[PDB]
Structure formats: structure tokens, C-alpha cells
């Protein structure tokens, strides 16, 4: 089957976003148990930006790697032009929902940095910021997981509509 | 070094187009064809990355606070953190170059075009010094073009 190309890309996009959420959580918790200077805060900022760049770069790589396997399948005669254009469009929809999740986690970490600066002070608000971020980051990740499963479900139905066309 | 020269020329020119807005008319070095097709690849893929992640890129830029030429080493430190898991692929490389272009546009608007070439050199230095043999095994910029061809 050629929808394994889309399924693989769907799992990889969800893993990269899940790993990004986990990296941002541990960076916040490391900065919360720590006593921060201006230099430590800037090292944390560089590590947050690297996590975002890594996630975006790895999502981009997986989508382009998925498109190479699809083009491979067209030249191998294992898919026709209409099936390949449905596979490429499903990979484009995965790219967009995965990009939105990365943008939302970067915007989410920004709000977390504002709490580590302003409200921080007292172990109790420390722990509520930690669980606030943990909750909102997982919400972003599961919304991507569900949108990615929906994009494959959309591809499998457009595959059954192309077979239902016959040769008309 | 030919690999450093070609990489810096592609990255220098891409960062300079994004900040100023003009293309450089001056002829390339010895590469020529490969460097041109890498810039067309950078204009297609890199501009898309900047637009589809403008929210994330703008937030990173404000918190990194890139002001003068001593802040420019901060993106080279970000590159090292990006690669600290041992994974190297073209998607990460194109994304770092696109954030370099995103930073270059900001440097022009804060009257620090002075910093763009030092930014391009340090991005190229980390890329070539720390991943030379990977780049050679991926057939350099010819493989970068081949990877992002549709």
C-alpha cells in the first residue's frame, strides 16, 4: 500500500511535536528548580530556540522524505497520477497542521518565560506554571495527533473515490 | 576551501537578498550552476519556512535579542544545540539558514546591516567545520538541491 507513506509521515510529525513538547517541559522544570541569573536565562533561551528549529527542521525533513517515497512510487508504477496527487496533498495537510503545532508551542513557551520572570517566587506558583504548561503543551500535541489521523482518513477516502470513478 | 567558499557564497547571498531586497548581480565563483540552483532552492524552501513559522520565528528573535555584532554568535550556539542529538539532515540545515535570513531582515531594520556578513560567516563556519564530511557524503549543495526538488 502507498498510504503507508502518509501514515509514516503522520507518525513522524506527531513524534517530533511530542518530543518538542517534552523538551520544552524539561527546560522549564530545569529553570524552575534552578536559581536564574541573566546568563542562565539566555542559555535557556538559546536551548528553547534550538528545540523549535530542530522540530521545524525535522518536520520539514520528514515531509520532503515522504514526498520522495511517493515520487518513487509513481515512477515504479505502484501509484498513478491521481493517486500521487492525493498522496502529495495529504502530505501538504500534514505539513500545515504540524507547522501550526510548532508555532503554538513556541508561543506557549513564550508565555511560560513571562511567568518564570514575573510571577516566579514561591514553590506553589512554580508548580502551577509547571502544570499549566504541561497541560497546554499536551493539548497542542493531541490536537496535532487527531488532525494527523484525520488527514490520513481523508486520504483513504479520496483513494476510494478514485477507484469508484472507474475509467469515466 | 572550496566547500566553505561555495557555502558562504550561497548563504551570504540569500541572507543579503532577504535583508536588502535586491539580488546580487555579481558573478559567482567556480561552482556557478550548483550555487544558482541552491539559491533558487533557498528562495522557495526558505521563504516558505519563514512564512509558515513566522509566529515561532518572531518569538525566538525577540527573546534572543540580536542587537549588535557580539550578539551574532548566539545563533551559532543555537546551531550547536540543534545538532546536540547527533541527527543531521537537510531540513534542519535549511531551517537554520531560513532563521538566519529572518534575523538578517531584522538587522537591516535596526541599522545593523554591518552584522549580516558576520552572521553568514558564522552560520557557514559551524555548518562546514562541524559537518564537513556529512556534507561531502551527501554530495554537498548538489544533494541539497536534489533533496528539495519536486
Swiss-Prot record, chain B:
Main location: membrane
UniProt superkingdom: Eukaryota
Motif (BH2): 133-148
Protein role: Involved in the regulation of apoptosis versus cell survival, and in the maintenance of viability but not of proliferation. Mediates its effects by interactions with a number of other regulators of apoptosis. Isoform 1 inhibits apoptosis. Isoform 2 promotes apoptosis.
GO biological process, one term: negative regulation of extrinsic apoptotic signaling pathway in absence of ligand
UniProt subunit comment: Interacts with HIF3A (via C-terminus domain). Interacts with BAD, BOK, BIK and BMF. Interacts with PMAIP1. Interacts with BBC3. Isoform 1 interacts with BAX, BAK1 and TPT1. Heterodimer of isoform 1 and isoform 2. Homodimers of isoform 1 or isoform 2 are not detected. Isoform 2 does not interact with pro-apoptotic BCL2-related proteins. Interacts with RTL10/BOP. Interacts with BCL2L11; may sequester BCL2L11 to prevent its pro-apoptotic activity. Interacts with GIMAP5 and HSPA8/HSC70; the interaction between HSPA8 and MCL1 is impaired in the absence of GIMAP5.
Location in chain, cross-link Glycyl lysine isopeptide (Lys-Gly) (interchain with G-Cter in ubiquitin): 23, 26
Localization annotation: Membrane; Cytoplasm; Mitochondrion; Nucleus, Nucleoplasm
Natural source organism: Homo sapiens (Human)
Family assignment from sequence similarity: Belongs to the Bcl-2 family.
Motif position, BH1: 81-101
Effect in UniProt of substituting residue 63 to R: No effect on ubiquitination
Alphabetical UniProt keywords: Apoptosis, Cytoplasm, Developmental protein, Differentiation, Isopeptide bond, Membrane, Mitochondrion, Nucleus, Phosphoprotein, Transmembrane, Transmembrane helix, Ubl conjugation
Residue positions of motif BH3: 38-52
Modification after translation: Cleaved by CASP3 during apoptosis. Treatment with taxol or okadaic acid induces phosphorylation on additional sites.
Record GO cellular component, one term: Bcl-2 family protein complex
Name this polypeptide is given: Induced myeloid leukemia cell differentiation protein Mcl-1
Effect of residue 23 to R: Reduced ubiquitination
UniProt effect for mutating residue 26 to R: Reduced ubiquitination
Induction / repression: Expression increases early during phorbol ester-induced differentiation along the monocyte/macrophage pathway in myeloid leukemia cell line ML-1. Rapidly up-regulated by CSF2 in ML-1 cells. Up-regulated by heat shock-induced differentiation. Expression increases early during retinoic acid-induced differentiation.
GO molecular function: BH3 domain binding; channel activity; protein heterodimerization activity; protein transmembrane transporter activity
Keyword Transmembrane attached: yes
Amino acid at each position: 500500500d502507498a498510504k503507508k507513506v502518509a501514515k509514516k509521515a503522520a507518525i513522524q510529525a506527531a513524534r517530533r511535536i511530542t518530543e518538542l513538547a517534552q523538551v520544552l517541559v524539561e527546560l522549564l522544570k530545569e529553570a524552575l528548580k534552578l536559581d536564574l541569573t541573566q546568563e542562565m536565562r539566555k542559555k535557556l533561551i538559546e536551548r528553547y530556540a534550538a528545540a523549535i528549529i530542530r522540530a521545524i527542521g525535522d518536520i520539514n525533513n520528514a515531509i520532503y522524505q515522504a514526498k520522495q517515497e511517493a515520487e518513487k512510487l509513481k515512477k515504479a508504477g505502484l501509484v498513478d497520477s491521481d493517486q500521487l496527487d492525493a498522496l502529495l496533498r495529504a502530505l501538504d495537510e500534514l505539513q500545515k497542521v504540524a507547522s501550526k503545532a510548532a508555532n503554538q508551542l513556541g508561543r506557549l513557551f513564550e508565555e511560560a518565560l513571562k511567568r518564570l520572570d514575573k510571577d516566579n517566587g514561591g514553590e506553589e506558583e512554580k508548580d502551577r506554571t509547571a502544570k499549566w504548561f504541561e497541560f497546554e503543551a499536551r493539548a497542542i500535541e493531541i490536537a496535532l495527533r487527531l488532525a494527523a489521523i484525520g488527514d490520513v482518513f481523508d486520504l483513504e477516502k479520496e483513494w476510494r473515490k478514485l477507484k469508484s470513478r472507474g475509467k469515466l | 576551501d572550496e566547500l566553505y567558499r561555495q557555502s558562504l557564497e550561497i548563504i551570504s547571498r540569500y541572507l543579503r537578498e532577504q535583508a536588502t531586497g535586491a539580488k546580487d548581480t555579481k558573478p559567482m565563483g567556480r561552482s556557478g550552476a550548483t550555487s544558482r540552483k541552491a539559491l533558487e532552492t533557498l528562495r522557495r524552501v526558505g521563504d516558505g519556512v519563514q512564512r509558515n513559522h513566522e509566529t515561532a520565528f518572531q518569538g525566538m528573535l525577540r527573546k534572543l535579542d540580536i542587537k549588535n555584532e557580539d550578539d551574532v554568535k548566539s545563533l551559532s550556539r543555537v546551531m550547536i544545540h540543534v545538532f546536540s542529538d547527533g541527527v543531521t539532515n537537510w531540513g534542519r540545515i535549511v531551517t537554520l539558514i531560513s532563521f538566519g535570513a529572518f534575523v538578517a531582515k531584522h538587522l537591516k531594520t535596526i541599522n545593523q546591516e554591518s552584522c549580516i556578513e558576520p552572521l553568514a560567516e558564522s552560520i557557514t563556519d559551524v555548518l562546514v567545520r562541524t559537518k564537513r564530511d556529512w556534507l561531502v557524503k551527501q554530495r554537498g549543495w548538489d544533494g541539497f538541491v536534489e533533496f528539495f526538488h519536486v
